[PDB]
C-alpha cells in the first residue's frame with residue numbers, strides 16, 4: 001500500500017465505529033478484545049506490553065508503518081493468517097487513509 005494523508009476527522013469516526021469496541025489508543029489505555037494501540041507506529045506486531053497475542057501475530061513481526069498498516073487493514077486475515085482479529089477489513093483505500101491519518105495522531 002501507499003499511504004496518503006486523508007481526513008483525520010473521518011478517521012476518528014471510523015476508529016470509533018469500527019475499531020473502538022476492541023481497541024483503545026490512549027497511553028495507559030486498557031487492552032480489550034484487542035491490544036491498546038498507543039505507540040503502534042514505533043513497534044513491531046505482537047509487542048504491546050501486557051497483551052496476549054497469537055503466535056501468528058507475533059511471528060509476522062511486522063514493523064508497523066503507515067503503508068503496511070494500510071495493507072494489513074485491507075484484509076487482516078490475508079495479511080496475518082491465523083490472527084484472531086475478527087475484522088474483515090476496510091476495503092476502500094480512502095477509508096484506510098482516513099483511519100491511518102487519525103491513528104498516526106491518536107496513538108502518539
Ligand code: HEC
Pocket residue numbers: 014015018019020021022023033034035040044045046047048052053054056057073082083084085086087090099
Ligand atoms: C475485535 C472484534 C476487533 C476489531 C473490531 C478490530 N480489531 Fe484489531 N485486533 C484485535 C485482536 C484480538 C488483535 C490481536 C490479534 C492477534 O492475532 O493476536 C488485533 C490486532 C490489531 C493490530 C496489531 C496490533 C499489534 O500487533 O500490536 C492492529 C494494528 C489493529 N488490530 C488495528 C485495528 C484497527 C485499526 C481496527 C479498526 C479498523 C481494528 N483493529 C478492528 C481485535 C479487533
